């Protein structure tokens with residue numbers, strides 16, 4: 001298990017523009033296209049990202065390409081935030097996967113105001129952080145997922161991803 005498989009599990013793979021649980025235009029492996037509700041804005045966006053007129057559709061490789069760039073960006077986003085950086089570096093490898101997941105899912109923005117959990121995670125108060133983390137919109141909107149990540153943080157193992 002690693003980050004890519006893990007994310008591949010929680011996000012799925014779709015080769016045609018689709019709406020995400022929030023109702024936003026996405027594609028591939030959790031690749032956000034636009035928050036706008038115009039499918040055409042979406043399409044333009046895809047075209048720009050892939051580098052060609054896609055007409056709302058892409059290939060596997062293209063998907064994976066975006067995915068790579070995205071995990072990349074996540075981590076970089078983490079390493080570049082003064083609040084995140086120190087927490088991330090305190091964690092072990094599994095738990096670091098969980099940090100990237102969240103980030104991938106909710107932005108460096110979303111994650112940044114989870115202050116209390118941040119602090120908890122830094123102190124290594126697993127069970128505590130895990131409870132705190134559930135008290136959130138993120139958990140309530142996407143419970144199955146949120147639960148896998150949260151377990152990941154809590155245990156330090158891949159069990160949630162069996």
Ligand SMILES: C=CCc1ccccc1O
Nearest residue numbers: 084087088099102111114
């Ligand atoms: C609650 C946030 C956990 C966390 C720590 C470090 C970097 C990213 C991240 O999501």
Ligand SMILES: [Cl-]
Nearest residue numbers: 048049050069
């Ligand atoms: Cl791109």
Ligand SMILES: [Cl-]
Nearest residue numbers: 142143144145
């Ligand atoms: Cl879910």
